[PDB]
Amino acid sequence: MLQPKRTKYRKPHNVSYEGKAKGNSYVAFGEYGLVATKGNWIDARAIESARIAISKCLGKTGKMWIRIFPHMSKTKKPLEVRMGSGKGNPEFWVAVVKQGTVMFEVANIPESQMIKALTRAGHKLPVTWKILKREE
């Protein structure tokens, strides 16, 4: 469970996912990568599912990198509560993925499982994923 150790402000304004790709746009640690095609809010819970999926379908020597991190939190008012009396309490942490950010990358194992591994990682996530390779 990826989680920030501490934050200065518990309840910050939400960060928009509309726009192009600011950083984490090109595979730079591995050489195959899972790029996004639709900006959306994906939470820290989805990261472990995608990471666990990759790890379960990995081998004994494959290596993986997680680029995005759920820095920003979001709140949720308790049920049956009318609006007012302050902001709700933070409930879950989401990483902001914009269209074009490389989320997961893999290297150091043959071609077929890596394509399959990235596929299973992207089926656990709501965004529409796509496979890309590293420029020589």
Instruction: Tell whether residue 130 is a contact of RNA (CB under 7 A).
Output: no
Smallest distance from RNA to CB 111, Å: 21
Which range, of 40-48, 50-58, 79-87, 117-125, touches RNA by CB under 7 A? 79-87
Torsion of CA 5, 10, 11, 12, to 10 degrees: -60
Dihedral sign of CA atoms 87, 93, 97, 101 in order: positive
Would you give the end-to-end CA distance of the chain in angstroms? 34
Site string for RNA, 2-41 (x = CB under 7 A): -xxxxxxxxxxx-x---xx-xxxxx-xx------------
Instruction: Tell whether residue 77 is a contact of RNA (CB under 7 A).
Output: no
Instruction: Tell whether residue 59 is a contact of RNA (CB under 7 A).
Output: no
The residue among 81 and 112 lying less far from RNA, judged by its C-beta, is 81
Contact between 19 and 39 (Cβ < 8 Å): yes
Smallest distance from RNA to CB 123, Å: 21
**Total residues contacting RNA (rule CB under 7 A)?**
35
What is the C-alpha R_g of the chain?
17
How far apart CA 1 and CA 126 sit, in angstroms, is: 19
H runs (alpha helix) in 83-136? 111-123
Q: Which residues bind RNA (CB under 7 A)?
A: 3-13, 15, 19-20, 22-26, 28-29, 63, 65-69, 71-72, 83-87, 96
